[PDB]
Amino acid sequence: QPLNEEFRPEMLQGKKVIVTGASKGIGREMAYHLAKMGAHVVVTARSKETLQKVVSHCLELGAASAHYIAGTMEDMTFAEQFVAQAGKLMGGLDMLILNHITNTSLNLFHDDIHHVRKSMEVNFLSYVVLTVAALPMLKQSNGSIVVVSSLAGKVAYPMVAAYSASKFALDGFFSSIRKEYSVSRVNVSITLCVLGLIDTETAMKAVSGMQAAPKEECALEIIKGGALRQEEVYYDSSLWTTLLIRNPSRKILEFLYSTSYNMDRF
Amino acid sequence: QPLNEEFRPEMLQGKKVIVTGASKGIGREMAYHLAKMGAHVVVTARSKETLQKVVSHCLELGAASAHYIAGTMEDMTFAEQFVAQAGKLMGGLDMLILNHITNTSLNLFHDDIHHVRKSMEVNFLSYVVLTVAALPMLKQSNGSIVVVSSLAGKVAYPMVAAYSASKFALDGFFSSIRKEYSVSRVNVSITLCVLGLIDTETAMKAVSGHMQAAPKEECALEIIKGGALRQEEVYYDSSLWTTLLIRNPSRKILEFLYSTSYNMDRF
Numbered sequence: 001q002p003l004n005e006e007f008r009p010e011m012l013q014g015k016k017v018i019v020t021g022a023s024k025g026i027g028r029e030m031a032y033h034l035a036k037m038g039a040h041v042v043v044t045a046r047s048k049e050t051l052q053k054v055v056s057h058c059l060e061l062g063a064a065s066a067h068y069i070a071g072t073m074e075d076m077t078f079a080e081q082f083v084a085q086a087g088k089l090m091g092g093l094d095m096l097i098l099n100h101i102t103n104t105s106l107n108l109f110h111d112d113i114h115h116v117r118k119s120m121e122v123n124f125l126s127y128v129v130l131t132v133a134a135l136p137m138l139k140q141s142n143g144s145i146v147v148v149s150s151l152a153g154k155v156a157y158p159m160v161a162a163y164s165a166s167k168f169a170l171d172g173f174f175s176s177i178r179k180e181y182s183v184s185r186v187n188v189s190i191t192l193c194v195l196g197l198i199d200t201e202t203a204m205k206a207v208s209g210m211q212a213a214p215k216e217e218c219a220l221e222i223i224k225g226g227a228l229r230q231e232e233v234y235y236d237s238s239l240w241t242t243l244l245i246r247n248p249s250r251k252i253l254e255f256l257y258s259t260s261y262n263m264d265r266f
Numbered sequence: 267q268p269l270n271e272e273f274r275p276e277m278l279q280g281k282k283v284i285v286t287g288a289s290k291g292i293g294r295e296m297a298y299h300l301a302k303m304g305a306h307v308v309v310t311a312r313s314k315e316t317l318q319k320v321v322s323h324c325l326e327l328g329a330a331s332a333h334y335i336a337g338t339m340e341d342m343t344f345a346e347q348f349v350a351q352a353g354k355l356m357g358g359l360d361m362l363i364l365n366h367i368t369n370t371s372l373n374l375f376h377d378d379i380h381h382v383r384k385s386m387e388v389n390f391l392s393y394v395v396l397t398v399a400a401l402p403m404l405k406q407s408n409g410s411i412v413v414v415s416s417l418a419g420k421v422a423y424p425m426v427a428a429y430s431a432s433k434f435a436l437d438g439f440f441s442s443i444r445k446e447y448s449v450s451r452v453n454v455s456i457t458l459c460v461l462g463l464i465d466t467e468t469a470m471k472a473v474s475g476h477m478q479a480a481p482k483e484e485c486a487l488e489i490i491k492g493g494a495l496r497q498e499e500v501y502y503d504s505s506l507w508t509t510l511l512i513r514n515p516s517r518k519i520l521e522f523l524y525s526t527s528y529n530m531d532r533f
């Protein structure tokens with residue numbers, strides 16, 4: 001159930017977020033916005049020298065507080081422990097924003113199984129492990145998990161097979177536990193963000209060789225959705241998608257199945 | 267794009283087909299239907315005994331031939347070589363049917379990342395591995411890859427998170443490379459089967475305590491029908507509401523409002 005207010009920067013002030021993939025692009029902007037709202041941010045990325053710059057410029061923008069921990073999400077242990085640390089560092093946690101991904105480029109898929117596996121590992125399994133680790137704290141606070149996905153995690157695009165596989169997976173997994181949290185009275189929201197082409201560095205480089213959209217706002221929308229506990233956010237420069245992307249039938253089928261079968265079965 | 271005729275059992279006659287998870291359940295039914303049709307058949311699962319039951323019955327039903335090879339699709343090496351063996355045993359491959367999943371049961375998700383990882387490995391990664399290994403023969407025959415899925419890989423459900431993740435992923439991957447096969451002019455069909463509850467042994471066991479299951483035998487027949495006709499998806503569920511609502515014609519619109527709306531010559 002979305003909080004039925006409208007968004008206001010106040011909602012974030014004093015709140016204990018975590019952004020991953022915060023060293024650049026969308027993730028970075030998010031830490032900043034968070035900063036401008038006076039959140040306790042705890043950033044993360046592989047780039048340790050760069051994280052500092054970001055933390056530092058977050059304190060400059062107004063953060064209640066701001067730290068970074070640098071690790072690779074290829075590593076499940078790092079991911080798990082990371083969350084504990086960001087905990088102690090911030091004295092609990094209100095919001096897990098899960099944004100990072102492994103590198104990829106635009107190519108037909110031919111036989112790089114290793115790239116498929118790694119994409120699943122970094123883009124998906126790590127998100128879960130982050131999740132499992134962070135759930136306890138979030139229960140205490142009735143917090144939120146925000147998950148950054150893409151049009152290509154809703155509809156099919158060539159040249160990004162591995163990456164799509166992993167974005168879909170996020171939908172499947174997280175929508176599913178959303179059903180579960182609900183039939184279990186576990187009061188943690190989960191927001192899935194579906195983004196179109198955004199003007200990050202990485203994206204602009206790979207496509208340079210379509211209309212992109214402003215990374216500053218995209219990041220703000222992500223934060224709004226999360227704050228308002230919406231199930232979903234759509235953010236694309238086009239106006240067909242925002243309207244054609246939503247799946248009313250899916251919603252109907254879920255409704256039917258949910259109100260027709262207790263889940264109190266066990 | 268599909269064949270333009272209604273289905274005929276003949277279409278499978280002489281065809282060479284792999285079926286996985288074919289010792290029991292929907293797999294087994296698929297072997298059986300294939301046999302009655304006179305296709306060569308290689309079936310695989312972990313248990314050599316149950317397989318043997320099945321190979322022996324496909325022979326009696328009038329397979330052109332029928333064999334089995336055992337291993338677990340937890341093992342990528344096995345998955346890769348498995349397809350080579352099977353291709354030798356038949357001198358080719360017309361259809362790759364991907365059906366197996368890791369044993370899983372109905373539970374709230376709590377902890378078991380290992381179950382999340384294993385489900386991704388078996389239900390998803392192994393399929394990519396199988397396809398990669400089989401694509402050279404499939405090109406050569408202009409055949410078909412059939413990927414077995416579930417309503418829960420098109421909409422959310424409680425109690426099957428891990429599984430559902432792995433099924434969505436199948437939609438993402440396989441629907442993406444289908445878009446690729448189109449622009450690379452690869453003449454191999456990809457069919458994604460979306461299944462509601464099916465009265466297989468294992469499913470019925472898990473749901474013993476009002477849910478309407480659909481019949482394994484017809485289900486298995488629809489999959490093979492959608493495959494042979496090279497359709498993009500097959501929906502099969504006991505409910506007509508569901509079979510109608512599950513379609514997503516918008517999504518096919520967006521995908522097309524980009525297909526032509528942009529250029530893939532570079533790649």
Ligand SMILES: NC(=O)c1ccc[n+]([C@@H]2O[C@H](COP(=O)([O-])OP(=O)(O)OC[C@H]3O[C@@H](n4cnc5c(N)ncnc54)[C@H](OP(=O)(O)O)[C@@H]3O)[C@@H](O)[C@H]2O)c1
Binds near residue numbers: 074149
């Ligand atoms: N930009 C778009 O057009 C587009 C479209 C739709 C959705 N999105 C989504 O937006 C989110 C962020 O994308 P973006 O464009 O901001 O990407 P980006 O600029 O390329 O940033 C990726 C972030 O994740 C980090 N990262 C990369 N590999 C990592 C690893 N192995 N372990 C830990 N961190 C790693 C990177 O920093 P380090 O290398 O320093 O670790 C960086 O901070 C992604 O989920 C993406 O799918 C982007």
Ligand SMILES: NC(=O)c1ccc[n+]([C@@H]2O[C@H](COP(=O)([O-])OP(=O)(O)OC[C@H]3O[C@@H](n4cnc5c(N)ncnc54)[C@H](OP(=O)(O)O)[C@@H]3O)[C@@H](O)[C@H]2O)c1
Binds near residue numbers: 290310368461
């Ligand atoms: N029944 C349903 O309600 C339902 C609904 C939607 C979709 N589906 C899809 O239907 C497909 C078939 O399901 P089913 O219900 O027919 O299942 P099933 O009868 O339980 O069959 C599972 C098959 O997979 C094999 N298998 C299990 N683990 C394996 C492994 N590690 N490596 C290789 N093979 C393995 C099993 O044999 P061994 O144990 O001998 O290894 C068996 O042959 C699945 O993809 C499922 O998601 C089923």
Ligand SMILES: C[C@](O)(c1ccc(C(=O)N(C2CC2)[C@H]2CC[C@](O)(C3CC3)CC2)cc1)C(F)(F)F
Binds near residue numbers: 157203
């Ligand atoms: C990692 C990287 O930045 C990236 C950036 C954006 C996306 C993404 O989410 N896309 C869908 C639109 C939202 C892209 C948009 C760009 C295109 O349509 C390609 C086909 C011509 C692919 C789909 C995926 C990866 C990459 F790959 F460019 F490096």
Ligand SMILES: C[C@](O)(c1ccc(C(=O)N(C2CC2)[C@H]2CC[C@](O)(C3CC3)CC2)cc1)C(F)(F)F
Binds near residue numbers: 425462464469
């Ligand atoms: C492994 C197993 O056979 C299985 C069989 C079927 C499915 C499946 O695809 N389902 C969707 C409808 C198609 C299930 C139907 C069963 C339920 O709705 C659960 C909530 C009570 C879950 C969704 C998943 C797993 C199991 F777990 F039942 F044994």
